[PDB]
Design a protein around this ligand. Sequence first.
Ligand SMILES: Nc1nc2c([C@@H]3N[C@H](COP(=O)(O)O)[C@@H](O)[C@H]3O)c[nH]c2c(=O)[nH]1
Ligand SMILES: Nc1nc2c([C@@H]3N[C@H](COP(=O)(O)O)[C@@H](O)[C@H]3O)c[nH]c2c(=O)[nH]1
Ligand SMILES: Nc1nc2c([C@@H]3N[C@H](COP(=O)(O)O)[C@@H](O)[C@H]3O)c[nH]c2c(=O)[nH]1
Ligand SMILES: Nc1nc2c([C@@H]3N[C@H](COP(=O)(O)O)[C@@H](O)[C@H]3O)c[nH]c2c(=O)[nH]1
Ligand SMILES: [Mg+2]
Ligand SMILES: [Mg+2]
Ligand SMILES: [Mg+2]
Ligand SMILES: [Mg+2]
Ligand SMILES: [Mg+2]
Ligand SMILES: [Mg+2]
Ligand SMILES: [Mg+2]
Ligand SMILES: [Mg+2]
Lengths: 214, 214, 214, 214
Amino acid sequence: SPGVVISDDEPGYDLDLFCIPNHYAEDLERVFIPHGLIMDRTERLARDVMKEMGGHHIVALCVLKGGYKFFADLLDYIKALNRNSDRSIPMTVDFIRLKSYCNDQSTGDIKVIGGDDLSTLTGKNVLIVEDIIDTGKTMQTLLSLVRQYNPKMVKVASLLVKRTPRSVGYKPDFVGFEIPDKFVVGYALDYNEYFRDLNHVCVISETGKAKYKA
Amino acid sequence: SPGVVISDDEPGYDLDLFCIPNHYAEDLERVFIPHGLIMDRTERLARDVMKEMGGHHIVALCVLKGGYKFFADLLDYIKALNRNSDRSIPMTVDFIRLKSYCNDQSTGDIKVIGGDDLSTLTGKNVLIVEDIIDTGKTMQTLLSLVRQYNPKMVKVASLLVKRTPRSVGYKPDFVGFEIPDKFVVGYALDYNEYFRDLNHVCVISETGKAKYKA
Amino acid sequence: SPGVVISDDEPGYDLDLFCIPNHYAEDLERVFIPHGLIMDRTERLARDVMKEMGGHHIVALCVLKGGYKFFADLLDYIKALNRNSDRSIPMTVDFIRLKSYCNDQSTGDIKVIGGDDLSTLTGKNVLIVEDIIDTGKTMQTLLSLVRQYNPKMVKVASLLVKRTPRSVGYKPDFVGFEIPDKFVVGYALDYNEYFRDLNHVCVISETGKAKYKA
Amino acid sequence: SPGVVISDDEPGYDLDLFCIPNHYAEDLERVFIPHGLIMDRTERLARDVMKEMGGHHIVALCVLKGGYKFFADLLDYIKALNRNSDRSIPMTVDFIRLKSYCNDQSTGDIKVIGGDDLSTLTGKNVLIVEDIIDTGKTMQTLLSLVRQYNPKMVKVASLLVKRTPRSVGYKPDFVGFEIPDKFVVGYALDYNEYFRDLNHVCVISETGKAKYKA
Ligand SMILES: Nc1nc2c([C@@H]3N[C@H](COP(=O)(O)O)[C@@H](O)[C@H]3O)c[nH]c2c(=O)[nH]1
Ligand SMILES: Nc1nc2c([C@@H]3N[C@H](COP(=O)(O)O)[C@@H](O)[C@H]3O)c[nH]c2c(=O)[nH]1
Ligand SMILES: Nc1nc2c([C@@H]3N[C@H](COP(=O)(O)O)[C@@H](O)[C@H]3O)c[nH]c2c(=O)[nH]1
Ligand SMILES: Nc1nc2c([C@@H]3N[C@H](COP(=O)(O)O)[C@@H](O)[C@H]3O)c[nH]c2c(=O)[nH]1
Ligand SMILES: [Mg+2]
Ligand SMILES: [Mg+2]
Ligand SMILES: [Mg+2]
Ligand SMILES: [Mg+2]
Ligand SMILES: [Mg+2]
Ligand SMILES: [Mg+2]
Ligand SMILES: [Mg+2]
Ligand SMILES: [Mg+2]
């Protein structure tokens, strides 16, 4: 499945219809995926993960920085299931930071800003949690590093998957939303480190990208 | 504003993409407004209410049974604002229950199944909290009833407003979502008492319509 | 089980440690039961209910006005279980109002301000949801009324149970907290209709009792 | 403010009163600080942070892995204030991983696994978010590292502060709870990587210590 498909027509929502930080209004064009919707979709994704890896101990690997919010929420929903059902996915949490984007584009060079503690993943079931699959370079690179160590199994959950001509074609195991070729921010996703402190996933305005341009 | 407008050519979301009670699986067609989206819009509605009435003491009147969820959540968001800024809108709460629907049509006979404690509304600023304005008979009836007690002011917040030829033309002061002419259920809104125990506002299938038909 | 037992020697927390509505600042003495603690306890109560009535269709009956918050939250947790497991407690909802308190004491006279439609309880499994059992007059009156309609089974859930000499000794099927003989407000529990718009269950100050005295 | 002071003989709660992960049923002794209580305290902490640094651009620095849950939640509450008031603390978010514990013991040798990014802190207002101050060694080392790059200002928010003779005597700027000399787990706080996937802060059972010992 492709997840919740947001066609290139979806108009999104007027900023005035929700609560958005005033210091960002100037720089945002529309609310694209409201936080509450992300939550509802993530609750389902958590049940999907539980069905797929339920009877196993897992190592949840958070791809910093962009995946931090999705990582926290996805694990909370899995935790909810773990304490309210017969099913139980015991979890250990790991973090790794990869960097390669400047402005609204990938530089093509993915760097591991530390956390290559991937050697401990040998024989383990790994659940990688990322914010968005764009060109697919980051995940392609991450998967290469992880597989190096022979983990028992590796699954990838990405909140978003972008429909772009630049995509390598990589598809995650779990996907919240499939979106158009627009640079989105919010929910931990940034534009040169800004907009991470934003509840909803929005689209940056032209004046916004210009103002925060590197 | 007319709120968040959901167009006629909008097919909602696949039930498959969310978590819905299995005991309702075949009874629903699609998810129309995810719970989280309702919360996000309700958060903004609370700020708008406080902006308009936040300067005074308010009496929140809940229109049972359908408005119970929206009433609870809207008040919670208003309380969140109250305890996180000097901006305070003291609130007292009241409930009145009106009945007139059978299956998916209004009998045209709006019965007050308990609710004349309305005398306590005299001289007060009233915020009526309702689930949906359809033909408008209910709210028209309620407004007439409340006006009999001379409140200081009366404002109405309805989570939904349906675009239907059957409407009287009434428009609330606050509106969450403007929807197509479809009988929705969930979020305390029912179909012959069922579907109230449902997080998301959904469209009732034909099998559900028959299964729970009065 | 007696629920979470709070001893007579427990004073609660300084108002300074939490966020509380500014308009009630001087009217409250201490935070007695943090909202989040109520939520955590309610979550287990929802699992307990599911374990006792899960195999059946239930009619949740809300005792207005004080039980409205506990009713909304308990049902929300029950719903959460319902959409994340084959275990499904399908439920319909009803509301009933019982008035008898003036200031911080019962007036003896218990008026059932709306409740002829309890006939819908006939032959069904009922879950009564109430805020607090004090003298026991209210619940006693309610149980008698409901029995008149011959329901299949009745179970009561009370957020609080007060340790007081005035109590008749009634014990609910589910209890959140067993508290000392103090007049608490907040979480929908009032003092002459005030303090319902309060997240935490708190103890009133003498100034609050005096200022809102009736 | 010294935060919520938890007494030496604090009993905590029977696990049977809350919902805990099945895989930890025999590994915990008591629920020490309920998740909901942590949330309530964190809400106030966010308002306190906003009161002290609300008029400026702040860099929130998460001390991994322990402070990941507190960091997410504290920032979420700050964001809630940011999108609902005139005051806005635009935040950028950074992470730094420090490691020094084995079982329930501090090796005294702190390792900086990833965070050199600290050069970007020059002339910025830094809010360090940590899980707990025990011996004080970790925060001591961190402030030294951060201060090396001349930040405009640095404040420390620690969810917990342990009363221990081993303590150096460091006092954070914001403190959630001051606890007795016990090795707590949960809410991202681990015991050899275990117990992070647990919502409540609990005390470890004797069987848990032996099963998860390093
Ligand atoms: N805010 C915001 N970040 C990204 C990214 C960042 N780049 C990475 C994915 O890149 P790629 O697939 O191109 O290798 C992710 O880790 C993500 O954080 C890609 N597309 C967007 C986008 O549209 N918006
Ligand atoms: N579940 C579900 N309830 C209603 C109602 C109920 N009828 C009332 C509004 O009716 P009207 O405007 O026609 O008088 C509301 O109180 C609402 O509870 C109208 N339309 C719908 C609908 O599409 N779905
Ligand atoms: N706010 C606040 N309400 C009540 C009540 C109200 N009275 C009813 C119970 O009364 P009784 O058992 O005494 O007959 C409940 O419906 C409850 O709402 C009792 N004690 C308190 C209290 O300490 N505080
Ligand atoms: N789970 C759990 N972790 C810690 C720690 C970890 N050690 C660090 C603080 O140690 P110190 O002050 O001794 O240097 C923190 O980063 C914290 O994660 C100290 N005490 C406890 C405790 O009681 N429980
Ligand atoms: Mg990234
Ligand atoms: Mg980025
Ligand atoms: Mg109605
Ligand atoms: Mg109805
Ligand atoms: Mg009552
Ligand atoms: Mg009362
Ligand atoms: Mg640590
Ligand atoms: Mg640790």
